Design a binder for these strands. Structure first.
Ligand SMILES: [Ca+2]
Ligand SMILES: [Ca+2]
Lengths: 105, 62
DNA sequence: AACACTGCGAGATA
DNA sequence: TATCTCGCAA
């Protein structure tokens, strides 16, 4: 059982700054895993608290294993924010703009 | 307030009518795999039919 | 079954 | 002499 995310949704991560998530069990109880090529760019764009998810290991040429960062672990209450961020009607697009601005400054 | 609505409507990169390219820019940046033919919201938003969305039409969409 | 990602000198430049 | 490119290393 991994430790829970803080109130602000901060995840506790390993030495490389990632969370290792090889089994559903490994997702914190108050968190969710969002797998998407751009889920990281999204969470960084929202400036919200997340942790990159190492879901497996890619074995590759020369001699070296590589971690597969297939996405993000965020707190549950930020799922739809993230999904909007990765995902983006008129109201949704506008509201995400409104948020992006109340957040940046 | 009107100022708040214009700000919401003035959150692009022109300040002239919301163009198809402008809506595309916003939808592409917030993550949206939307086809060029996936105007939908903006497309339907066009009340007077000039192929763009002016302030009054933006207000009515919101 | 995890290292990082960008600095730094080559030629060339009005 | 100030300015980019751009390969280059890891
Ligand atoms: Ca415009
Ligand atoms: Ca119109």
């Amino acid at each position: 059982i991994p430790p829970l995310a803080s109130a602000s949704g901060e995840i506790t991560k390993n030495t490389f700054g990632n969370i290792e998530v090889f089994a559903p069990t490994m997702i914190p109880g108050n968190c969710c895993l969002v797998e998407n090529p751009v889920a990281i760019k999204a969470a960084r764009f929202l400036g919200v608290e997340f942790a990159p998810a190492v879901t497996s290991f890619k074995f590759e040429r020369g001699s070296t294993v590589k971690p597969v960062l297939s996405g993000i672990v965020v707190a549950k209450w930020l799922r739809e924010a993230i999904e909007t961020a990765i995902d983006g009607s008129w109201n949704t697009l506008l509201l995400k703009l409104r948020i992006r601005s109340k957040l940046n400054s | 307030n009107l100022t708040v609505i214009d700000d919401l409507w003035s959150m692009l990169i022109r300040n002239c009518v919301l163009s198809v390219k402008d809506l595309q820019k916003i939808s592409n940046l917030i993550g949206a795999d939307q086809s060029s033919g996936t105007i939908e919201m903006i497309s339907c938003a066009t009340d007077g039919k000039r192929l763009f969305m002016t302030y009054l039409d933006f207000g009515c969409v919101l």
